[PDB]
Structure 1
Amino acid sequence: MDETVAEFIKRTILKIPMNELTTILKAWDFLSENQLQTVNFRQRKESVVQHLIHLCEEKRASISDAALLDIIYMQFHQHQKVWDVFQMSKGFDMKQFKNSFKKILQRALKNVTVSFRETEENAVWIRIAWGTQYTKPNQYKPTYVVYYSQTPYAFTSSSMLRRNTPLLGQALTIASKHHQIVKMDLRSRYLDSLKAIVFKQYNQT
């Protein structure tokens, strides 16, 4: 394998606390539980991740599995980031949506990285790593989209890298079966308040 994704997985697991690292690695579903039994969970963190990488040196790795680990890490640290709320209008399986969004985005720019994850209430967590037409995509400044199939609403993570916001908006509007995209005032830290302020109005229109 390449010698770039190992630093990413090491940095991501170094960001994970010891309180639920076994929960992350059981939910990530990538290594054998015998190899979970082999790893000492009592020494310090600066060698546990070395042993886990040395497990992942041998068997399998990618950028997609590291991205899905990053998605599961971001799903349990919603207190950190600050979210944004969008909505589409002017107008269903999710497989065609995934293919359409990928294609579109890969036809828009040269180098992007897209990753999906299925979650209940028909939720999809979409990690986007932006790039240019000459550079590698920056994995360390992602952009996360919480999209629902039923509601036309989408939760948007802020990032350092702007200027791809209307490109992502139009590519997701064409990628969906829609024509318009809005940008409300709703920018807050916790997802449940945005969830309530959307769903109290949408379920009771």
Structure 2
Amino acid sequence: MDETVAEFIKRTILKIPMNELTTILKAWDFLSENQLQRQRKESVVQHLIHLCEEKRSDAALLDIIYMQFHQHQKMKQFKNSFKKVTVSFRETAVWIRIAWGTKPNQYKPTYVVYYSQRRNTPLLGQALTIASKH
């Protein structure tokens, strides 16, 4: 589980480019600020994952920022009600991301649909367009 949390964490850090590794990893604040204490990309994940033992659904929110720095590969209780990962919102430019759709499978491609105003595709459109009063 925490292994499977680390496996989503290890693959996410490896997927980002090292020309912008320190930029987007600082935007997640998954670790703390000054704790980033540069040489080898494969070795940097080997220390940061052991550095992820401090702060320990806990780490997928960094990937929703990773879709902002890579956007070419594709109340607000109107999504968490569909609990039959889960939804992982993030504030924004007045909208949010989802990174939601999964049994538990959060390392597969979850859907991404903002709102600026597989088989799960058949019902994820139903819970959205809830048409509340906002």
TM-score normalised to the size of structure 1? 0.54
Q: CA deviation at 1:13?
A: 0.3
Say whether residues 1:43 and 2:39 are aligned partners: yes
Give the 3 Å change call, closer, same or farther, for CA 68–28 of structure 1 in structure 2: same
Q: Distance in 2 between matches of 1:166 and 1:124?
A: 26
Q: CA deviation at 1:52?
A: 0.5
Q: Gaps (5+ residues) in structure 1?
A: 82-93, 104-111, 151-161, 178-205
Q: CA deviation at 1:128?
A: 5.7
Q: Distance in 2 between matches of 1:127 and 1:11?
A: 20
Q: Distance in 1 between matches of 2:64 and 2:12?
A: 11
Give the 3 Å change call, closer, same or farther, for CA 124–66 of structure 1 in structure 2: farther
Q: Residues 116 and 126 of structure 1 are in contact (CA less than 8 Å); yes or no, is this contact kept in structure 2?
A: yes
Secondary structure of the equivalent of 2:7?
A: helix
Secondary structure of the equivalent of 2:22?
A: helix
Give the 3 Å change call, closer, same or farther, for CA 125–66 of structure 1 in structure 2: farther
Q: CA deviation at 1:113?
A: 1.6
Structure number with higher helix proportion:
1
Q: CA deviation at 1:139?
A: 1.8
Report percent identity of matched pairs.
100
Task: Give CA deviations for 1:47-89 in whole Å, capped at 9, x if unaligned.
Answer: 10111111111333xxx342101111111111222xxxxxxxx
Q: Residues 116 and 125 of structure 1 are in contact (CA less than 8 Å); yes or no, is this contact kept in structure 2?
A: no
Q: Distance in 2 between matches of 1:127 and 1:100?
A: 16
Give the 3 Å change call, closer, same or farther, for CA 125–4 of structure 1 in structure 2: farther
Structure number with higher strand proportion:
1
Q: Distance in 2 between matches of 1:141 and 1:127?
A: 16
TM-score normalised to the size of structure 2? 0.78
Q: Residues 100 and 175 of structure 1 are in contact (CA less than 8 Å); yes or no, is this contact kept in structure 2?
A: no
Greater relative CO, 1 or 2 (CA 8 Å, sep 6+): 1
Q: Residues 125 and 144 of structure 1 are in contact (CA less than 8 Å); yes or no, is this contact kept in structure 2?
A: no
Q: Distance in 2 between matches of 1:148 and 1:127?
A: 8
Say whether residues 1:72 and 2:72 are aligned partners: no
Q: Residues 129 and 137 of structure 1 are in contact (CA less than 8 Å); yes or no, is this contact kept in structure 2?
A: no
Q: Distance in 1 between matches of 2:104 and 2:77?
A: 24
Q: Distance in 2 between matches of 1:166 and 1:69?
A: 27
How much is the aligned-residue C-alpha RMSD, in angstroms? 3.0
Q: CA deviation at 1:136?
A: 4.0
